[PDB]
Design an enzyme around this catalytic site. Structure first.
Site, PDB file in Angstrom:
ATOM      1  N   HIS A 177       0.285 -92.626  44.911  1.00 10.18           N
ATOM      2  CA  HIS A 177      -0.263 -93.434  44.449  1.00 10.18           C
ATOM      3  C   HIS A 177      -0.591 -94.697  45.048  1.00 10.18           C
ATOM      4  O   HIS A 177      -1.283 -95.378  44.486  1.00 10.18           O
ATOM      5  CB  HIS A 177      -0.497 -92.673  42.321  1.00 10.18           C
ATOM      6  CG  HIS A 177      -1.231 -93.141  42.389  1.00 10.18           C
ATOM      7  ND1 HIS A 177      -2.662 -92.535  41.833  1.00 10.18           N
ATOM      8  CD2 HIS A 177      -1.358 -93.936  40.969  1.00 10.18           C
ATOM      9  CE1 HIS A 177      -3.199 -93.413  40.649  1.00 10.18           C
ATOM     10  NE2 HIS A 177      -2.570 -94.179  40.524  1.00 10.18           N
ATOM     11  N   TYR A 180       0.415 -95.662  48.147  1.00 11.20           N
ATOM     12  CA  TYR A 180      -0.420 -95.963  49.801  1.00 11.20           C
ATOM     13  C   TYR A 180      -0.169 -95.377  51.317  1.00 11.20           C
ATOM     14  O   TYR A 180      -0.586 -95.521  51.717  1.00 11.20           O
ATOM     15  CB  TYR A 180      -1.845 -97.019  49.730  1.00 11.20           C
ATOM     16  CG  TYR A 180      -2.565 -96.470  48.825  1.00 11.20           C
ATOM     17  CD1 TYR A 180      -2.789 -96.542  47.056  1.00 11.20           C
ATOM     18  CD2 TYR A 180      -4.387 -96.549  49.000  1.00 11.20           C
ATOM     19  CE1 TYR A 180      -4.045 -96.526  45.965  1.00 11.20           C
ATOM     20  CE2 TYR A 180      -5.494 -96.441  48.158  1.00 11.20           C
ATOM     21  CZ  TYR A 180      -5.310 -96.114  46.759  1.00 11.20           C
ATOM     22  OH  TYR A 180      -5.817 -96.109  45.987  1.00 11.20           O
ATOM     23  N   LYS A 237     -16.168-100.300  40.728  1.00  6.81           N
ATOM     24  CA  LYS A 237     -15.411 -99.684  41.217  1.00  6.81           C
ATOM     25  C   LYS A 237     -15.382 -98.289  41.066  1.00  6.81           C
ATOM     26  O   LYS A 237     -15.832 -97.882  40.224  1.00  6.81           O
ATOM     27  CB  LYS A 237     -14.210-100.409  41.641  1.00  6.81           C
ATOM     28  CG  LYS A 237     -12.411 -99.802  42.082  1.00  6.81           C
ATOM     29  CD  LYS A 237     -11.459-100.286  41.588  1.00  6.81           C
ATOM     30  CE  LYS A 237     -10.116 -99.924  42.399  1.00  6.81           C
ATOM     31  NZ  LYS A 237      -9.127 -99.839  41.832  1.00  6.81           N
ATOM     32  N   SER A 264     -10.286 -92.696  40.591  1.00  7.53           N
ATOM     33  CA  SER A 264     -10.234 -90.947  39.104  1.00  7.53           C
ATOM     34  C   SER A 264      -8.907 -90.313  39.249  1.00  7.53           C
ATOM     35  O   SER A 264      -8.206 -91.688  38.621  1.00  7.53           O
ATOM     36  CB  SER A 264      -9.715 -90.076  41.180  1.00  7.53           C
ATOM     37  OG  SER A 264      -8.426 -89.999  42.118  1.00  7.53           O
ATOM     38  N   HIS A 265      -9.259 -89.193  38.504  1.00 11.52           N
ATOM     39  CA  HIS A 265      -8.253 -88.718  37.679  1.00 11.52           C
ATOM     40  C   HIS A 265      -7.539 -87.128  37.454  1.00 11.52           C
ATOM     41  O   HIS A 265      -8.397 -86.846  36.730  1.00 11.52           O
ATOM     42  CB  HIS A 265      -8.241 -89.074  36.248  1.00 11.52           C
ATOM     43  CG  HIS A 265      -7.199 -90.465  35.285  1.00 11.52           C
ATOM     44  ND1 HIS A 265      -6.620 -90.564  34.041  1.00 11.52           N
ATOM     45  CD2 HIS A 265      -6.604 -91.104  36.291  1.00 11.52           C
ATOM     46  CE1 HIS A 265      -6.106 -91.335  33.794  1.00 11.52           C
ATOM     47  NE2 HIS A 265      -6.007 -91.974  35.100  1.00 11.52           N
ATOM     48  N   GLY A 305     -24.737 -89.920  37.170  1.00  8.65           N
ATOM     49  CA  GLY A 305     -24.035 -88.792  37.494  1.00  8.65           C
ATOM     50  C   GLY A 305     -23.911 -87.886  38.589  1.00  8.65           C
ATOM     51  O   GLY A 305     -25.458 -87.166  38.068  1.00  8.65           O
ATOM     52  N   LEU A 309     -22.620 -84.451  39.935  1.00  9.06           N
ATOM     53  CA  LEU A 309     -21.869 -83.197  39.599  1.00  9.06           C
ATOM     54  C   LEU A 309     -22.079 -82.222  40.362  1.00  9.06           C
ATOM     55  O   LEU A 309     -23.266 -81.563  40.805  1.00  9.06           O
ATOM     56  CB  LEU A 309     -22.273 -82.712  38.264  1.00  9.06           C
ATOM     57  CG  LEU A 309     -21.739 -81.823  37.315  1.00  9.06           C
ATOM     58  CD1 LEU A 309     -20.544 -81.359  37.500  1.00  9.06           C
ATOM     59  CD2 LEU A 309     -21.850 -81.544  36.209  1.00  9.06           C
ATOM     60  N   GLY A 362     -32.503 -89.585  41.829  1.00  6.89           N
ATOM     61  CA  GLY A 362     -31.926 -89.891  43.073  1.00  6.89           C
ATOM     62  C   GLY A 362     -30.702 -91.069  42.982  1.00  6.89           C
ATOM     63  O   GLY A 362     -30.039 -91.498  43.059  1.00  6.89           O
ATOM     64  N   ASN A 408     -15.473 -96.721  47.444  1.00  6.72           N
ATOM     65  CA  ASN A 408     -15.447 -95.218  47.658  1.00  6.72           C
ATOM     66  C   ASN A 408     -14.402 -94.582  46.771  1.00  6.72           C
ATOM     67  O   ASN A 408     -13.091 -94.804  47.131  1.00  6.72           O
ATOM     68  CB  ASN A 408     -15.485 -94.866  49.308  1.00  6.72           C
ATOM     69  CG  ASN A 408     -13.819 -95.725  49.916  1.00  6.72           C
ATOM     70  OD1 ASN A 408     -13.370 -94.046  49.928  1.00  6.72           O
ATOM     71  ND2 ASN A 408     -13.841 -96.698  49.855  1.00  6.72           N
TER      72      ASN A 408
HETATM   73  O1  LIG Z   1      -5.475 -95.301  33.003  1.00  5.62           O
HETATM   74  C1  LIG Z   1      -5.211 -95.812  34.164  1.00  5.62           C
HETATM   75  N1  LIG Z   1      -5.993 -94.675  35.484  1.00  5.62           N
HETATM   76  C2  LIG Z   1      -5.678 -95.548  35.975  1.00  5.62           C
HETATM   77  C3  LIG Z   1      -5.179 -94.890  37.396  1.00  5.62           C
HETATM   78  O2  LIG Z   1      -4.144 -95.851  37.774  1.00  5.62           O
HETATM   79  N2  LIG Z   1      -3.882 -93.652  36.880  1.00  5.62           N
HETATM   80  C4  LIG Z   1      -3.418 -93.454  37.668  1.00  5.62           C
HETATM   81  O3  LIG Z   1      -3.458 -91.738  38.233  1.00  5.62           O
HETATM   82  C5  LIG Z   1      -2.930 -90.820  37.857  1.00  5.62           C
HETATM   83  C6  LIG Z   1      -4.586 -89.577  38.581  1.00  5.62           C
HETATM   84  O4  LIG Z   1      -4.674 -90.201  40.618  1.00  5.62           O
HETATM   85  P1  LIG Z   1      -5.740 -89.012  40.660  1.00  5.62           P
HETATM   86  O5  LIG Z   1      -4.940 -87.277  40.318  1.00  5.62           O
HETATM   87  O6  LIG Z   1      -6.999 -89.222  40.440  1.00  5.62           O
HETATM   88  O7  LIG Z   1      -5.299 -89.218  42.113  1.00  5.62           O
HETATM   89  C7  LIG Z   1      -2.595 -90.813  36.413  1.00  5.62           C
HETATM   90  O8  LIG Z   1      -2.249 -89.280  36.211  1.00  5.62           O
HETATM   91  C8  LIG Z   1      -2.205 -92.462  36.460  1.00  5.62           C
HETATM   92  O9  LIG Z   1      -0.873 -92.410  36.599  1.00  5.62           O
END
Ligand SMILES: O=CNCC(=O)N[C@@H]1O[C@H](COP(=O)(O)O)[C@@H](O)[C@H]1O
Length: 602
Positions: free
Chosen positions: A31, A34, A67, A70-71, A135, A137, A387, A441
């Site tokens: 994470h 990289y 930008k 993801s989460h 969005g 989906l 679109g 991306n």
């Molecule tokens: O609130 C800050 N969000 C910024 C951030 O850097 N969040 C970090 O990304 C993880 C999710 O990553 P994924 O599973 O989407 O690759 C999340 O668990 C955080 O540690």
């Protein structure tokens, strides 16, 4: 991890202490570090040089900062908090760029509509007063254990108020302000790199957000910028204080002394390493001179936030973490900012294959966002249901936002499927009459150690597709180790495309004839011909729909907003085709196939 643990030991000349182990587990996690994507990323054509990443000049006076992030990991464990903080995170990214957050375009991939994910996004978006302008989906059983929550954020920023993303000289200090620090999100960076979702990362790993503080955060920060107080900035996300401070000084080739005891706490009985590694939300790191720090804290506290000068920027490139007069940790900064790099796989594309129809499922997020008082694209030039999201910058100025992906194709052939997703992103942008400017991306992949080719296949086609289209990468994110019991998610590259468009020239639907323009299949050598045909017809004032299904339910629904009815005989099409739907009074004349298929009326 093990291979990494041994390098740290090499480098340190001993085993790490408890603190250093927590630290590098964070910074050296996929994470934060990289490791697998760094080299592929460098080969990507970028809007780089342009001083600031993710910032694209719109009209020489205004720029668009955008930008996608993801989460995924956290959203699988706790849909609400993970999705909410997902938006909180990317919003802080665009703010650190100096831009007032203006739009959010989410890209969701789940095995069903997970309420918690859709509600965490709507609530946090509503409380911060930042609209969702669109969005994407996708519903597929292939995302059952690993839903994908990618959030794109964009903002308008003046070219003469661009904020830097690094420290620049010994003597600067770094202020951390926003919501107080707690224990939440502790180790979430590593949790989000865990070769598997069912690894030793759980509820102690997900962050808690609070949009009310974030709202106060943007106000305070923009006021700081407007007062010439911010000399650099970086939001606190994964790795928290540790990540923000080390990278800020790392980017400027400087070092830092961190005073954890200066970090405003929400939980005072926290240990020093917990303060350093906490991932509490709504926090921002500001690089500045000792003179401006007073006004910064004055502003922060006046906006009901907390903050103090936490670090000193030094000449020696060492990262020294202190707690009072106690030395918590001390290591070379560049050691922490440069995780071990993996060698890449050279990928050579094969013959474009004949895609099988992989049953997926789409849905207008707007129809699904009503349940939670969240409107999608209420303040746009033309409805995003057609679109692309089009927003006004000025009376005669604007930009478009597009989020597209083709995992259905990539699952069969990662290279071509991925490469097609981008080209189609170009069609969408062009179709609204916007000029493609840049891409943001989000690389959502499985396990790169078990399958290096799939990653290379995804990254190399993003490179080639950017080279083919002439649209560079302005910013982006990589999410790997997106697996469950080893079961990998489908390789999903999410393309966020920014376009330049004059709000006055954007076409609206009205009574007309419908024509299928293009081919029923795909050949790379005629894509540009399709774009050319789209450019010509758009210029003439034609309304154009570019969709994998040619015409979708969302489309039919959007036309309803104009009291318009569509009756046509959709041409037979392949999973990947090069055809667009054009609405006009007369027959379109282009050097691409043209077939009249129906009407739009009432
Ligand atoms: O609130 C800050 N969000 C910024 C951030 O850097 N969040 C970090 O990304 C993880 C999710 O990553 P994924 O599973 O989407 O690759 C999340 O668990 C955080 O540690």
């Amino acid at each position: 991890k093990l291979r990494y643990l041994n390098i740290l030991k090499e480098k340190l000349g001993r085993e790490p202490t408890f603190v250093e182990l927590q630290a590098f587990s964070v910074m050296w996690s996929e994470h934060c570090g990289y490791s697998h994507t760094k080299k592929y990323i460098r080969r990507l054509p970028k809007t780089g040089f342009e001083g600031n990443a993710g910032v694209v000049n719109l009209d020489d006076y205004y720029s668009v900062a955008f930008k996608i992030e993801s989460h995924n990991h956290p959203s699988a464990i706790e849909p609400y908090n993970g999705a909410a903080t997902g938006v909180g995170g990317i919003i802080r990214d665009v703010l650190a760029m100096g831009a007032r957050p203006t739009a959010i375009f989410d890209s969701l991939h789940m095995s069903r509509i997970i309420d918690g994910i859709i509600e965490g996004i709507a609530d946090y978006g509503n409380s911060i007063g930042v609209p969702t302008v669109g969005g994407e989906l996708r519903i597929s059983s292939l995302y059952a254990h690993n839903p994908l929550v990618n959030v794109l954020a964009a903002g308008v920023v003046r070219n003469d108020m661009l904020v830097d993303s690094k420290a620049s000289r010994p003597g600067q200090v770094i202020v951390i302000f926003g919501g107080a620090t707690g224990r939440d999100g502790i180790h979430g960076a590593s949790f989000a790199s865990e070769d598997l979702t069912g690894d030793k990362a759980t509820k102690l790993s997900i962050q808690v957000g609070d949009p009310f503080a974030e709202k106060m955060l943007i106000e305070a920060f923009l006021e700081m910028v407007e007062e010439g107080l911010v000399e650099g900035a970086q939001d606190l996300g994964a790795g928290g204080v540790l990540s923000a401070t080390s990278e800020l000084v790392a980017k400027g080739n400087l070092g830092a002394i961190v005073h954890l005891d200066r970090v405003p706490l929400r939980e005072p009985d926290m240990e020093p390493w917990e303060i350093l590694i906490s991932e509490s939300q709504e926090r921002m790191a500001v690089v500045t001179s000792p003179q401006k720090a007073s006004r910064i804290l004055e502003i922060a506290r006046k906006h009901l936030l907390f903050g103090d000068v936490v670090a000193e920027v030094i000449e020696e490139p060492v990262y020294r973490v202190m707690y009072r007069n106690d030395l918590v940790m001390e290591v070379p900064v560049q050691l922490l900012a440069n995780a071990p790099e993996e060698d890449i796989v050279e990928y050579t594309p094969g013959k474009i294959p004949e895609f099988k129809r992989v049953e997926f499922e789409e849905v207008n997020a707007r129809e699904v966002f009503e349940q939670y008082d969240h409107m999608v694209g209420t303040d746009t030039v033309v409805p995003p249901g057609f679109g692309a999201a089009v927003m006004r910058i000025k009376r005669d100025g604007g930009y478009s936002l597009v989020t597209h992906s083709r995992a259905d194709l990539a699952l069969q052939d990662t290279y071509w499927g991925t490469l097609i997703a981008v080209l189609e992103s170009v069609r969408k942008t062009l179709s609204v009459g916007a000029e493609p400017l840049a891409i943001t991306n989000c690389v959502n992949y499985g396990d790169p150690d078990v399958d290096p080719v799939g990653l290379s296949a995804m990254m190399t086609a993003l490179k080639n597709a950017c080279e083919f289209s002439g649209v560079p990468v302005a910013s982006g994110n990589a999410s790997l180790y997106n697996t469950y019991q080893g079961k990998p998610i489908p390789p999903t590259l999410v393309v966020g495309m920014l376009g330049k468009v004059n709000p006055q020239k954007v076409a609206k639907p009205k009574p007309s004839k419908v024509f299928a323009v293009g081919w029923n299949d795909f050949e790379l050598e005629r894509e540009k011909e399709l774009w050319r045909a789209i450019r010509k017809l758009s210029e003439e004032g034609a309304f154009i729909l570019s969709s994998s299904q040619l015409l979708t339910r969302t489309h039919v629904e959007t036309f309803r907003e104009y009291g318009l009815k569509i009756e046509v005989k959709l041409p037979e099409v392949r999973p990947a085709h090069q055809m667009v739907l054009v609405f006009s009074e007369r027959t379109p004349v282009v050097d691409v196939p043209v077939k009249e298929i129906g009407t739009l009326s009432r």
